[PDB]
Symmetry: C2
Subunit: 406 residues, 2 copies
């Protein structure tokens, strides 16, 4: 009651608080997306159009090779099912109502007043998914989630909470996409992820938006002793603006994270993509890998490694190709060592594709576009090593078709 009043106050105070990076959106220009959503008990019953849409972001209507499925359309949960008995999957609202302790995890890692986007999401009483793997259990197959914009020009506000209990493993694939014909809109998605002692969370996220969509995810991950967080973000399709900067706090001894990004910046697009790792306990490790290409958009690769404990080791690699006469690549690392006994290293490279590699492949009988296709496939593949195998084919198709359209 006092807590709720104090959070509402803080969130109201942040209504005009711009995010540090990315285009500033006037939230009043977007209608809040529908909080009523017609349930869909069986995803196989959907239209061919919506099924292909799901498939393009790695969401399988048949749930073949999936442990469960969660679907949000605009601001309401449309589907929530499980095949696996060692996972708990519920709407965030329903989880808050079931578990009185869940309030100890809600709006703790992500602050309600971080920026106007977190504030709006809090104030809208955002629903989302709650996913928990109890102690010692491992998901047999990935749980899939899908966040979908269905209205003309609305704001989607989502709040997810993931808890991986001691010694547990959770695999998740999230696809974010749009109804056919949806061109404008905002996605504000707050995710708070808790990995307890010896837990593991593998999280693959594929985005397919539209030319005038703004995207503002805010994600904070807390990794306890001997925990592991692996993230792979894939953003290969046109979109007006994405600005995402997940923070992973390595809180316990030997906590590790591997954070991966692949992206293609299209004309008229700003992609401001970052990763932050905070080394707060001895022996913590991070590998941050970004492989991106611009074909006319603006790409900013941010990476931040904050060394607060002895024995920590962190490495950031950012590479960004510029393929066209329009567009730009920026690499903006931050390495901060606040103790003596630490190793933080980084390499960055931006600019041209290798002319000799293109010419070598053309001599083998390939057009320039085909040659570029093969090179960029190899280049981007480094950033998606070890994603679920099943996802590679569609991703490769997207990369190939991009090269061949140049």
């Amino acid at each position: 009651q006092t807590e709720q009043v104090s959070l509402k106050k803080r969130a109201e105070s942040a209504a005009e608080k711009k995010a540090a990076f990315g285009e500033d959106f006037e939230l009043e220009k977007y209608e809040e997306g529908s909080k009523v959503s017609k349930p869909i008990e069986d995803l196989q019953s959907l239209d061919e159009e919506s099924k292909k849409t799901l498939l393009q972001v790695g969401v399988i209507p048949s749930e073949e090779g999936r442990s469960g499925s969660f679907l949000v359309l605009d601001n309401a949960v449309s589907h929530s099912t499980l095949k696996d008995k060692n996972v708990e999957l519920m709407s965030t609202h329903k989880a808050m109502e079931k578990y009185e302790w869940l309030k100890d995890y809600s709006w703790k890692l992500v602050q309600v007043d971080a920026d106007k986007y977190t504030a709006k999401t809090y104030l809208e009483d955002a629903d989302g998914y709650f996913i928990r793997v109890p102690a010692g259990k491992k998901t047999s197959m990935p749980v899939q989630t899908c966040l979908m914009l269905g209205s003309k020009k609305a704001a989607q506000t989502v709040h997810n909470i993931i808890i991986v209990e001691e010694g547990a493993t959770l695999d998740i694939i999230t696809g974010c996409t749009t109804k056919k014909g949806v061109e404008e809109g905002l996605h504000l998605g707050i995710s708070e992820m808790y990995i307890k002692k010896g837990g593991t969370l593998n999280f693959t996220m594929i985005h397919n938006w539209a030319e005038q969509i703004g995207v503002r995810p805010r994600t904070v991950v807390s990794v306890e002793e001997g925990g592991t967080y692996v993230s792979n973000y894939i953003c290969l399709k046109p979109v007006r603006s994405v600005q995402t900067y997940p923070t992973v706090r390595l809180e316990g001894e030997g906590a590790v994270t591997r954070l991966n990004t692949i992206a293609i910046a299209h004309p008229g697009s700003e992609l401001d993509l970052g990763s932050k790792a905070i080394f707060n306990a001895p022996g913590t490790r991070a590998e941050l890998i970004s492989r991106t290409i611009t074909i006319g958009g603006r790409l900013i690769a941010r990476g931040e490694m904050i060394g607060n404990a002895k024995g920590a080791k962190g490495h950031l690699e950012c590479k960004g190709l510029v393929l066209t006469d329009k567009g730009s690549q920026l690499a903006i690392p931050i390495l901060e060592a606040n103790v003596d006994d630490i190793e933080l290293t980084h390499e960055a490279a931006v600019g041209k594709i290798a002319k000799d590699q293109v010419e070598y492949l053309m001599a083998r009988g390939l057009t320039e576009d085909e040659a570029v296709g093969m090179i960029i496939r190899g280049f981007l593949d480094v950033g998606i090593r070890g994603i679920p195998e099943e996802l590679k084919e569609e991703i490769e198709n997207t990369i190939a078709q991009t090269a061949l359209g140049m």
Copy 2:
């Protein structure tokens, strides 16, 4: 004429304009340093303390191995002589009185309204040195300049202009220091350097301030076709705050710059040291090397490479050791590719000295302090390759004594 009124208006409007980085100084707290000083005709008639002070920052009262000398005490030129009649050396005030055309170079590369420090420097009608090396001519020995703070808590404001004409070469050594017993003060030093087609400017700068001194250099270098700018900055002694971020514009085909920094951040020190290279013509080249150590201060390595022209290649390396339990190392360099046909690369490393290397040297009979000494000599030497040989012995002494006092 109308121009002077414009610049004054601009400078006045920026009187309160904080610099983007570094501690903000209240300019009102510093009395402007004396604009009068007794002429010192013979440097060797200087008192032995003053001569020691000069020698500590690489300035030779005897002028052996030197082409000329320029000395500023507080805000007044105290000495200006040349051994040879090729180079032109005069105070900035006297050059501005002599040459109507110098108005085309003065306050052009550095804007009067960049920040409150450039503004103050403009408004105080700062003096300094003007050097011109006539077309095709070369210094046979480096010119030496020295800037000295001599009052209890004064603001020093200097404005220097260097013009290296077509095919010419200038070697310069600058030492910046304080009179004995001087502990507080502010140094504001604006330098505008022009390198014409085929010209070369080799510039070495050694700083030795005091524990409560703030230092705000603003330097812009303009490098024409086939020109070369080499900079070596050395900052090994206690100082409250240094914030410097020279910009080098590579304006003509094949212009090259090599920018080097070595530093040691002492307790209670902030060192915010950057280099910016802008590639504005094809075939332009930059190599930016920074090697620094904290023994309790805060060290920030800034670097920026902006690629605006096809065929450019730039490389930044920054390494920063943290040797003590207090202190921090931050590496924040920036790569920006604005064209496709370009190569920008960088590597950054912050954190520990190599434990195995310390242990190896200790086993050979050395104390920990001696072993650290040998390692940091090797580590910092990378950033002072190519400085005039004569300066190395004193610098190595400083590095050695620092390790040995730990």
